[PDB]
């Protein structure tokens, strides 16, 4: 019952402000290709993702973020980076989180991730090496569907999100090439029922798209001696699973 560790390799002779930005960057969730104790940096950068000439859009970036391993970054020695690997059943750490999302969160709710569709505002641009390290968001699984469907209901017509009391308001243009007819096919198959290779598409493609947009939560918040509300940009404890 011992914890896992991942050690990131850092280059040398970096400017004394970006290396301070990694002192500003602790508590985010990082996604991992495979669990290895000898890990470089670029492997959790945007460049080691599904690039086919472009950074991967959320239509399959969500599939990657779910298929890939998770972790939480903690204090960083000026030499190396220490981060706790999560997603296996690592027992009872003092695990915290830094919420990286424009949404608000309360105490007592399940937390998951989603690929960004809004911007790239908090990621690190390492202009010295030419490599970008990106991170996901953190939303409750009360809104996993009420965050996805609400932005694309707008994106269907061209071709206010509420939680805790804060009335707040590219990678989508590929996703709608597999959904607009995903239900029109149910409309057609209602007439097609009242052929052996006509049921060969819909049942399988709908199910390839179904498990992935009904995701499950991997983190849940916990506080013993502290507040009961966490705002975007804090360091508060959670519990895995």
């Amino acid at each position: 019952a011992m914890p896992f560790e991942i050690e990131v390799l850092l280059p040398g002779e970096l400017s004394p402000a970006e290396t301070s930005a990694l002192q500003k960057c602790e508590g985010k969730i990082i996604t991992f290709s495979t669990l290895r104790h000898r890990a470089s940096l670029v492997d959790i950068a945007l460049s080691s993702y599904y690039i086919n000439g472009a950074p991967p859009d959320t239509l399959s970036l969500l599939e990657a973020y779910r298929m890939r391993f998770a972790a939480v970054i903690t204090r960083v020695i000026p030499g190396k980076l220490l981060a706790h690997a999560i997603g296996v059943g690592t027992p009872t750490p003092g695990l915290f989180i830094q919420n990286t999302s424009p949404v608000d969160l309360c105490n007592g709710d399940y937390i998951c991730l989603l690929p960004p569709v809004f911007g790239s505002a908090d990621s690190i641009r390492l202009d010295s090496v030419g490599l970008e390290i990106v991170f996901p968001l953190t939303i409750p699984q009360t809104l996993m569907r009420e965050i996805i469907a609400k932005v694309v209901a707008r994106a269907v017509e061209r071709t206010v999100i509420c939680y805790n009391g804060r009335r707040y308001e590219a990678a989508i243009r590929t996703l709608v090439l597999n959904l607009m007819f995903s239900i029109n096919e149910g409309c057609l198959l209602l007439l097609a029922l009242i052929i052996y290779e006509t049921i060969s598409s819909w049942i399988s493609t709908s199910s390839r798209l179904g498990d992935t947009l009904g995701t499950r939560a991997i983190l849940r918040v916990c506080v013993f001696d502290g507040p009961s509300t966490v705002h975007p940009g804090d360091r508060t404890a959670v519990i895995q699973v």
């Binding site: 011992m2 896992f4 560790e5 669990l35 104790h37 000898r38």
Partner: protein, 48 residues
């Protein structure tokens, strides 16, 4: 006396080294190999 005998299996065991790596993980070390071997008898005579 290799005459009042039928067969024998003299089976032995060897090791399987395990290069101790960095920080742990579940690997569940192998147990043994324990290969078994058969015995075959030949013979030869003369004429005089």
């Amino acid at each position: 006396e290799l005459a009042y005998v039928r067969d024998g299996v003299i089976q032995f065991e060897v090791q399987q080294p395990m290069i101790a790596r960095d920080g742990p993980h579940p690997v569940d070390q192998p147990v043994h190999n324990y290969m078994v071997k058969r015995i075959h008898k030949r013979s030869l005579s003369a004429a005089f």
